[PDB]
Paper text:
To decipher why a G at this position restricts cleavage, we made DNA substitutions in the cleavable DNA target to render it non-cleavable. For this purpose, we exchanged GT in positions −5 and −4 of the wild type coding strand target (I-CreI_D75N_target, Fig. 1b upper sequence) by TG, generating the non-cleavable target I-CreI_D75N_target-null. As expected from in vitro cleavage experiments, the comparison of the crystal structures of the I-CreI variants in complex with its cleavable and non-cleavable target DNAs in favourable catalytic conditions (2 mM Mg2+), showed the hydrolysed phosphodiesters in the cleavable targets while the non-cleavable targets displayed the intact phosphodiester bonds. We observed that the structures of the variants in complex with the cleavable targets showed the presence of the 3 reported catalytic ions, while the structures in complex with the non-cleavable targets indicated the presence of just 2 catalytic ions, with the central metal position occupied by a water molecule. The absence of the central metal ion in the non-cleaved structures, would explain the different catalytic behaviour. Our results clearly point out that in the cases of I-CreI_D75N_target-null and I-CreI_3115_target-null sequences bound to the I-CreI_D75N and I-CreI_3115 proteins, A at position +1 largely deviates with respect to the usual B-DNA conformation. In particular, we found that in ~ 30% (I-CreI_D75N_target-null) and ~ 60% (I-CreI_3115_target-null) of the simulation time A +1 is not paired and is found stacked to the corresponding nucleobases. The larger flexibility of the A +1 in the active centre explains the low occupancy of the central metal ion within the active site, disturbing the positioning of the P-O bond for catalysis, thus inhibiting cleavage.
Numbering used by the authors:
A (entry chain B): 202 to 354
B (entry chain A): 2 to 155
The structure:
DNA sequence: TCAAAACGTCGTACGCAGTTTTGA
DNA sequence: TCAAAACTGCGTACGACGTTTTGA
């Protein structure tokens, strides 16, 4: 568990509000108790030509990794506990994605508890709905309603 | 000249490297002594639904305006003199657009002496070439060489 | 199972210009 | 003539998902 330079957090919050993405998903996966994975992702996108910038993120955040996909690359942070540490420090400086940040911090904390009750899990699922509401969501499919519509069994 | 708070500059540089644009142009306009205007623009683009963000920049930078062209909006800063003050304090915190900014800054300084000479005017136009090379330029037409092949017809 | 990684899809929301006009 | 504003075109570089696989 590490602490970040505030001047680095400020700059990064601006960049994240620009080209970053704080993403929460419900993934239809039969292998899970409630037939769905709760997925949290922090991501920063950039033209692969500027992959060096993303490399620096990995170095400076100390965790996460870069993935290439043709012309575009992504810094990706998915691991729940480093995500929590990082987002908790970033969140106060975000202006466009602060709500998304806080909802994710929230979702994370309620995660053991959500693996117990079919309707605690659905509650966390609605928090995910809120995150996508705040984002410029366009191709979403699996909402919280498609989750209770499955628990109908 | 207004001096900006460092925390504001830091966040903003990050946002500018994300969704901003530092733009230099050679505009074919025959009302100009060399048949072209040197145009410098600092721009921040955003979905109009989030206009408030851009409108706050107007408050915080204390100059510039916002225009809405349908689904997106822009904060625009063109006035050469506040542009210089602003980009001077912002530039140390930029990481992707630092070069563009420093280039725009010295285009501004040499702008009077470029009124003087067609040669000094072409040198300056070279700097505009460099700004566009550093950007993700895709639809450029008028270059420093377009200017040369027009100053020759004389 | 589950956290996490891997791999693909899709519609913009940006960026980066162009052209033309204003108003002394 | 000029600084500056106004208006327009266009091709991504992003954003924000989906679907499937890993590896104990
Ligand atoms: Mg953006
Ligand atoms: Mg929305
Ligand atoms: Mg960008
Ligand atoms: Mg380039």
């Amino acid at each position: 568990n590490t602490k970040y330079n505030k001047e680095f957090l400020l700059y990064l919050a601006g960049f994240v509000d620009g080209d970053g993405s704080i993403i929460a998903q419900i993934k239809p996966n039969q292998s899970y108790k409630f037939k769905h994975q709760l997925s949290l992702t922090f991501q920063v996108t950039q033209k692969t030509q500027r992959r060096w910038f993303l490399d620096k993120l990995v170095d400076e955040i100390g965790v996460g990794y870069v993935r290439d996909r043709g012309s575009v690359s992504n810094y990706i942070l998915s691991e729940i506990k480093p995500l929590h540490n990082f987002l908790t420090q970033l969140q106060p400086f975000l202006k466009l994605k602060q709500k998304q940040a806080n909802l994710v911090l929230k979702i994370i904390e309620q995660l053991p508890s959500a693996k117990e009750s079919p309707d605690k899990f659905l509650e966390v699922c609605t928090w995910v709905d809120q995150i996508a509401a705040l984002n410029d969501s366009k191709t979403r499919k699996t909402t919280s309603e498609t989750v209770r519509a499955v628990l109908d069994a």
